[PDB]
Amino acid sequence: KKYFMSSVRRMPLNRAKALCSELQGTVATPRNAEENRAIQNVAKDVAFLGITDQRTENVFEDLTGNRVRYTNWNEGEPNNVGSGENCVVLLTNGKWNDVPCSDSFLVVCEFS
Template sequence: MVIGHWWVLVIASVGILANAKAACKGNWAKTSGGCYWFSTNTATFHEAFTSCFAKKSTLLELKGKWQEKWIRFQSLLRGYDGVWIGATDLLHEGTYVYPSNGSKIRYSNWEGRQPGGGKKENCAVLALKSAGWHDYPCKHKFHYICVKH
């Protein structure tokens, strides 16, 4: 059953990547959810957020499980260990919001006892060597993905 889901993602990704340059300018990959830019370097949460803002886009905001599966697949293809999710609880401990608009996250996939870092870990990461999200110190460096809708 799991293999079938990955197979669908492979087929979908081939089609998406084949049309990426025609639909989105430069190194942006087009999907029905918008255009995605995958970093080649790691950055702190703030650096990633600022980089996406400079590209007139937002740091990745996961809205559902299929988007998360596609992002996980694309990130694994690129050799990422983790990807910043544009969510933080810096303003109010335990309440994760998207800084792009201040809204609370609606979809989440926290792993086990996550988020569990208290005031030392305030930024969300899609951890690729595990099954879900983790909270990390915002000064840690991960790859990141910018999204244009």
């Protein structure tokens, strides 16, 4: 099964990726509502998910460039505000929001 663990500190996506990979895991990518809720269980505050539309705007892929199916966008999202929000975070209500990849949030790593 997948196991989810949340970080203590906040960091931008690249550092989040490096953290999870240090222990041979990846940034949590929920594939369904059950997994989304499991990530919610460990995330005490807004946290990065392993999803981005960095390749093509409004086409969301996991960090391995594999287009995702399941999404749980908060109402009004994704809105790509300003210069661009190409990363994704899980809000404390379980819904998602696109944010700048350079902004800092907790990270939830995924292992199996």
